[PDB]
Amino acid sequence: AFNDLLQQVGGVGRFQQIQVTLVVLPLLLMASHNTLQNFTAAIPTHHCRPPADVWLPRDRQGQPESCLRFTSPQGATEPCTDGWIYDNSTFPSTIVTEWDLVCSHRALRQLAQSLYMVGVLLGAMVFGYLADRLGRRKVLILNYLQTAVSGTCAAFAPNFPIYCAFRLLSGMALAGISLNCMTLNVEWMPIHTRACVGTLIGYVYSLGQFLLAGVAYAVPHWRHLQLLVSAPFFAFFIYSWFFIESARWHSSSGRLDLTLRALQRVARINGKREEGAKLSMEVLRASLQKELTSAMELLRCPTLRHLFLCLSMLWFATSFAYYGLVMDLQGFGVSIYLIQVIFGAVDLPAKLVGFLVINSLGRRPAQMAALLLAGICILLNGVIPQDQSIVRTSLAVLGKGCLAASFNCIFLYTGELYPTMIRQTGMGMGSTMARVGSIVSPLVSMTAELYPSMPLFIYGAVPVAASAVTVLLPETLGQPLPDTVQDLESRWA
């Protein structure tokens, strides 16, 4: 037994203590690299440049129009041609100022985010197979270097295609590093110590936002902000050479001497110089007799369809509602730094109370309550006028907290419901649908010209219909996990 071997060699000692932190360190910058678009592409106030030879319309609010200008001295008007004048009050320079991505090309700002989010999905897909074929350490270091190079070269991009391609490569590598970090940590931790690691992961991810806000305030310029955000990955790659490959993959790959050498090294670096000397080729051979010995069932057989459909719908709806909700800090009214700080601070109590609710009551009432509350909050935010921020901002924050709680709730539910044979496949498909929702969310946010309230209305309407699906999901609180598809058949009967 692998757990028996881990308990014999020393379990969680100095080796694991160093490894967990040295592996989870970059997830602090994970959130920064995920959210950096909102701060490097903030749109400032602008208006049409006066001609090179009083020249600008005004609206009911009294501000000069940003896409119109006079044609006669002080009448008819002609579209802006010469250029644009921006305001350097709060944002000295962004990509919008650099490339004049306003009016006619206002969609390129969202197109950049969409092409970046394609990268995360493609990276997950490719690098899962790459890791399964060539181990975990090599793919980790390759993704480290790719992230470093892509992030460094993205700041120096004379052309929008160059910037977009570098962003897509960065997203690919970030997906790779995240997935491989999670897999390696799970593999090296014992079986019973997995919920603790997941909590740790969640916490780190939540705590990265404060660092993002601090560094963004420190460096307002977009080029320098990008460079400073992507710089530490080089030192991270430098230290990534001192990693040890996981024993599970080595055992499953048909090679035993490497696995035994790694186990002996781990035992002798933790401190158990007596226990680490008892490992033998034949003893390990006798111990490892059970471990040594797809989508077809996930879709075709009628036993998993009625669960896969609902789980995919829930994952997609959650990601679609969350990843577009996050990137709307400018429109509330208060300073975006304070808004980011509040968004990063409110998550912890929401997840705590969500954990309490799901552990004291059934899972379906918690799921439906979270989904419906998030949808209602978003709908009310869309309906309410934007003049008052004291209530609109608070409602948006409450919706974000509810969505954050629902994410963890569904993360637990999917694994706890899927049987032992398709559990990994179901989790992978759920993550894939989540990434698809994250991809489509900016494209829905694109549809703002037809109606100002259409994006918020759609964002608040999707979870409302999504929450009504959860009723069909059977509860599993205080019940043993299903093992075969036949066992689950009796429960639904």
Swiss-Prot record:
InterPro entries: MFS_dom (IPR020846), MFS_sugar_transport-like (IPR005828), MFS_trans_sf (IPR036259), Orgcat_transp/SVOP (IPR004749). Its main location: membrane. Residues 30-110, 163-165, 221-223, 328-337, 386-394, 445-453 are extracellular. Strongly expressed in kidney. Expressed at lower level in liver, skeletal muscle, brain and placenta. In kidney, found at the basolateral membrane of the proximal tubule. In testis, primarily localized to the basal membrane of Sertoli cells and weakly expressed in Leydig cells and vascular endothelial cells. SUPFAM superfamilies: MFS general substrate transporter. The record marks Y205 as: Important for interaction with cidofovir. Changing F407A: Decrease in the level of membrane protein expression, 70 % loss of PAH uptake, increased affinity for cidofovir, lower Vmax for PAH, and lower Km and Vmax for cidofovir. It catalyses: (6R)-L-erythro-5,6,7,8-tetrahydrobiopterin(out) + a dicarboxylate(in) = (6R)-L-erythro-5,6,7,8-tetrahydrobiopterin(in) + a dicarboxylate(out); L-erythro-7,8-dihydrobiopterin(out) + a dicarboxylate(in) = L-erythro-7,8-dihydrobiopterin(in) + a dicarboxylate(out); L-sepiapterin(out) + a dicarboxylate(in) = L-sepiapterin(in) + a dicarboxylate(out); prostaglandin F2alpha(out) + a dicarboxylate(in) = prostaglandin F2alpha(in) + a dicarboxylate(out). Changing L29A: Complete loss of PAH transport activity. Glycans are attached at N38, N88. One of its GO terms (biological process) is renal tubular secretion. The record marks F407 as: Important for interaction with cidofovir and PAH. The chain crosses the membrane at residues 9-29, 111-131, 140-162, 166-188, 200-220, 224-244, 307-327, 338-358, 365-385, 395-415, 425-444, 454-474. Secondary active transporter that functions as a Na(+)-independent organic anion (OA)/dicarboxylate antiporter where the uptake of one molecule of OA into the cell is coupled with an efflux of one molecule of intracellular dicarboxylate such as 2-oxoglutarate or glutarate. Mediates the uptake of OA across the basolateral side of proximal tubule epithelial cells, thereby contributing to the renal elimination of endogenous OA from the systemic circulation into the urine. Multiple cysteine residues are necessary for proper targeting to the plasma membrane. Involved in the renal transport of a variety of drugs with well-known nephrotoxic potential, therefore may play a role in the etiology of the drug-associated nephrotoxicity. Uptakes the diagnostic agent PAH/para-aminohippurate and clinically used drugs. Mediates the pH- and chloride-dependent bidirectional transport of PAH/para-aminohippurate in exchange for 2-oxoglutarate or glutarate as counteranions. Can also mediate PAH/cGMP exchange. This is Solute carrier family 22 member 6. It comes from Homo sapiens. The lineage of its organism: Eukaryota, Metazoa, Chordata, Craniata, Vertebrata. The gene is SLC22A6.
